[PDB]
Write an enzyme that holds these catalytic residues in place. Sequence first.
Site, PDB file in Angstrom:
ATOM      1  N   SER A  38       4.091   6.961  -6.351  1.00  0.00           N
ATOM      2  CA  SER A  38       2.789   6.852  -7.051  1.00  0.00           C
ATOM      3  C   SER A  38       2.070   8.221  -7.155  1.00  0.00           C
ATOM      4  O   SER A  38       2.510   9.099  -7.892  1.00  0.00           O
ATOM      5  CB  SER A  38       1.941   5.769  -6.365  1.00  0.00           C
ATOM      6  OG  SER A  38       1.059   5.160  -7.280  1.00  0.00           O
TER       7      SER A  38
ATOM      8  N   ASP B 249       4.929  -4.330 -10.999  1.00  0.00           N
ATOM      9  CA  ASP B 249       3.983  -3.391 -10.407  1.00  0.00           C
ATOM     10  C   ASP B 249       2.699  -3.587 -11.187  1.00  0.00           C
ATOM     11  O   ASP B 249       2.644  -3.297 -12.375  1.00  0.00           O
ATOM     12  CB  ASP B 249       4.498  -1.953 -10.614  1.00  0.00           C
ATOM     13  CG  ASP B 249       3.644  -0.902  -9.931  1.00  0.00           C
ATOM     14  OD1 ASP B 249       2.397  -1.046  -9.874  1.00  0.00           O
ATOM     15  OD2 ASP B 249       4.202   0.094  -9.445  1.00  0.00           O
TER      16      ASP B 249
ATOM     17  N   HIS C 111       4.827  -2.683  -6.396  1.00  0.00           N
ATOM     18  CA  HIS C 111       4.432  -1.287  -6.077  1.00  0.00           C
ATOM     19  C   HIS C 111       4.626  -0.980  -4.594  1.00  0.00           C
ATOM     20  O   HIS C 111       4.373   0.133  -4.134  1.00  0.00           O
ATOM     21  CB  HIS C 111       2.942  -1.136  -6.445  1.00  0.00           C
ATOM     22  CG  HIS C 111       2.415   0.264  -6.430  1.00  0.00           C
ATOM     23  ND1 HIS C 111       2.704   1.173  -7.425  1.00  0.00           N
ATOM     24  CD2 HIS C 111       1.542   0.878  -5.593  1.00  0.00           C
ATOM     25  CE1 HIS C 111       2.072   2.308  -7.175  1.00  0.00           C
ATOM     26  NE2 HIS C 111       1.334   2.146  -6.090  1.00  0.00           N
TER      27      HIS C 111
HETATM   28 CL    CL Z   1      -1.226   6.348  -5.634  1.00  0.00          CL
END
Ligand code: CL
Length: 278
Positions: free
Chosen positions: A147, A223, A256
Amino acid sequence: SIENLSSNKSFGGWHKQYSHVSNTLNCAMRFAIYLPPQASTGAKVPVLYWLSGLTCSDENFMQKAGAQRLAAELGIAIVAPDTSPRGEGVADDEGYDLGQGAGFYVNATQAPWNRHYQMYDYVVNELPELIESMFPVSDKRAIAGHSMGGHGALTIALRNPERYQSVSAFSPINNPVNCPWGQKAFTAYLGKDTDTWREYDASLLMRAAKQYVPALVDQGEADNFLAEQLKPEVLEAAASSNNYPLELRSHEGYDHSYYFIASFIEDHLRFHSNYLNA
Ligand SMILES: [Cl-]
């Protein structure tokens, strides 16, 4: 100036946590390292730098990714820095998306953040120098992240192509100039002139890349942040346009979380091993 804080034996190697006084961040910093069994033999091992996402510490990946099994087999050390400066004198925000736990791997130019938020220089210059000085490691390195950390890995690799053998990411923030996470952080750390943001956008860098670092990116299709924050199609488009060596894999049903990361981390280790061993 440098202190081993904790040690845990892990798959015949060692997970160790350190604190040190950072010259680039002007604050104390914590990082974790995994040394594989080969490091106990006299071998020098290559290093995978792992950069974590929003709110994470130097602990989350070490605890949850399950990378140690394969790192041990393949003889790879993993170094996991923290995600921001921390402690006395360091600016912060009450929100999870800014300040501590949220350095965005930039060199902040705006006050108050400029005093400590130099996470790009820390990861690119100070940290690897420190690691190579302390640990039985070679000069062969790779970089990966999740991320905000995937953003970190990609942008750092693309701007330092001679310094990294390979790069990979999980759920990267590909186009941070065009998402709320990136916009909030960049506006605060770098100011309102988006020309100053360009060098911190993976998709923009990749389109313009003059030298290739082999890349692998995994994205969970379930996600929740995919559309708004991550934008993998935008990375693919950049790659397509620049003949870039990017394999982007989309996985149905995956989210995620570290459950997703753990599910494909061995792929990432075998990928890096291919280039770290060269
Ligand atoms: Cl992040």
